[PDB]
């Protein structure tokens, strides 16, 4: 089988699927929805011509003459195996296309074994004889225009997609945009959808290492396709809401505990530009007490020792006296 590496594509994958010539288009490890918007490292194209009945053998986990002794696919195959009928073109008849039936062992996945070695199924060690019990392993396709269903010629091109092998230059179109840093954006940096802010990475990477797989198997390292710089992927800033309430018959005053984020980061870590105008009073406070589990915004710090009414994290309590955010006495 012929092998081609394809490196630079900016054009789309829309011609893959979406045509009636492509009759069989089962994609195992990827969806056809992902074809239009993806970005990958390497593209390999494998091409051969088979019969119609052995179309089902070219799959993960399938067996036969072709899948054992001619062409092997792995079980975790990411890509699309394509089959289409070619009855007019290859069948004139013509017997020039061959296949391998006899081999000593089954083939490894994506491994090519070209040989004209006589298979030893007989007692004698005969060499170079095309006769009885010296089996020549190559047999010919008997293609005629009188072929039945499953015995007509079919043409196959197999596309495989790879990760963490090459600098990513093979990926489809979006809106023409330039890079910004130090702000929270939907980055598509080598074309993957996600939200994060990237800095320059201090890691030294070999040039086959393009992406990264962490302990949760997400992308944590990435390299630019134009400049050969290295950057890491983390998402934007986090925080939480824990509301201080008395009973609703008493008062409608509240305060917010923020659970562990420093108070200069908490206007930035919340989406305060798109927030409700009530809550940004409760995000930037005049009396803000930083403690171990963050800081409480929307109440007043007093020093005086009161017994606890509302049990609140990191040694603070609240009481209705206005609501005071006091270090609790014990």
């Amino acid at each position, epitope marked *: 089988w*012929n*092998r*081609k*590496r394809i*490196s*630079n594509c900016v054009a789309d994958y829309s011609v893959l699927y979406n045509s009636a010539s492509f009759s069989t288009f089962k994609c195992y490890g990827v969806s056809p929805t992902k074809l239009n918007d993806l970005c990958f490292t390497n593209v390999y194209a494998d091409s051969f011509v088979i019969r119609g009945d052995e179309v089902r053998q070219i799959a993960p986990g399938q067996t036969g003459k072709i899948a054992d002794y001619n062409y092997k696919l792995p079980d975790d195959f990411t890509g699309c195996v394509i089959a289409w009928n070619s009855n007019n073109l290859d069948s004139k008849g013509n017997y*020039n296309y*061959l296949y391998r039936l006899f081999r000593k062992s089954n083939l490894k996945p*994506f491994e*090519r074994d*070209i*040989s*004209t*070695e006589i298979y030893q199924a007989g007692s004698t060690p005969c060499n170079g004889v095309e006769g009885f019990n010296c089996y020549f392993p190559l047999q010919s396709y008997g293609f005629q225009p009188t072929n039945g269903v499953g015995y007509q010629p079919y043409r196959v091109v197999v596309l495989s997609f790879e990760l963490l092998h090459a600098p990513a230059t093979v990926c489809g179109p979006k809106k023409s945009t330039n890079l910004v840093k130090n702000k929270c954006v939907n980055f598509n940096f080598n074309g993957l959808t996600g939200t994060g802010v990237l800095t320059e990475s201090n890691k030294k990477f070999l040039p086959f290492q393009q992406f990264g797989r962490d302990i949760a198997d997400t992308t944590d390292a990435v390299r630019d396709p134009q400049t050969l710089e290295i950057l890491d992927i983390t998402p934007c800033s986090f925080g939480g809401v824990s509301v201080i309430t008395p009973g609703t018959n008493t008062s409608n005053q509240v305060a917010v505990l923020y659970q562990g984020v420093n108070c200069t980061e908490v206007p930035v870590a919340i989406h305060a530009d798109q927030l409700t105008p009530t809550w940004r009073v409760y995000s930037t406070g005049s009396n803000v007490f930083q403690t171990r589990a963050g800081c409480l915004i929307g109440a007043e710090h007093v020093n005086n020792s009161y017994e606890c009414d509302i049990p609140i994290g990191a040694g603070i309590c609240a009481s209705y006296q206005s609501i005071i955010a006091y270090t609790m006495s014990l």
Partner: antibody
Amino acid sequence: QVQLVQSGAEVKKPGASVKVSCKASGYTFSSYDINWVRQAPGQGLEWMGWMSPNSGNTGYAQKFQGRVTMTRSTSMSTAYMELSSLRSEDTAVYFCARMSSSLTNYLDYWGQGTLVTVSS
Amino acid sequence: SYVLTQPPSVAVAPGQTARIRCGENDIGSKNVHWYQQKSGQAPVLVVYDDSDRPSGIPERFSGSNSGNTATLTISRVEAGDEADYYCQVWDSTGDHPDVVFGGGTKLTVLG
């Protein structure tokens, strides 16, 4: 550092046979495939055949089958392309050229070459 | 029947660009390789793929494969570039696997 060392120069008579060798060291020789390329003075590089050392399977060019007796021995890690029945057009320099471990088979290391002379 | 065709010679000024091509019918469906042989020594590979280069040889040498051409580009031509260059398209060749070499380009510097 992968290096390929060939033998000394050859002086011959027509109709004889050669024992051109290419010794390799520092790397696992049996896993990696070896091609032989000849070059006459004034001509381009000409592919002669391909050889797998561990399996022993040899493929040859369409004009050169039968005449060419590419063999190997892993006891002393030396290949031997023993061409037979020498003729006057077979005067060239012989290069042992390894294809790559990766597929599509780029030639990555060569030898310095040895020169054969065919005259009466 | 597939045979590689290469032009005989090309001459450039030093410090300028050079255009050396090896292109035939449907060469874009196959892989192209490039090599450098100096006069009297062993050949060295300088381009590994359609565009990718190995180590040692800098970013002076670049190329691309599209359609019916595969053109090597040499930038800031120096004295050391005067050698022999060959394209090495692999082909199935009617199920007799061949390593087809080109006819050879001789690049000469001026001055």
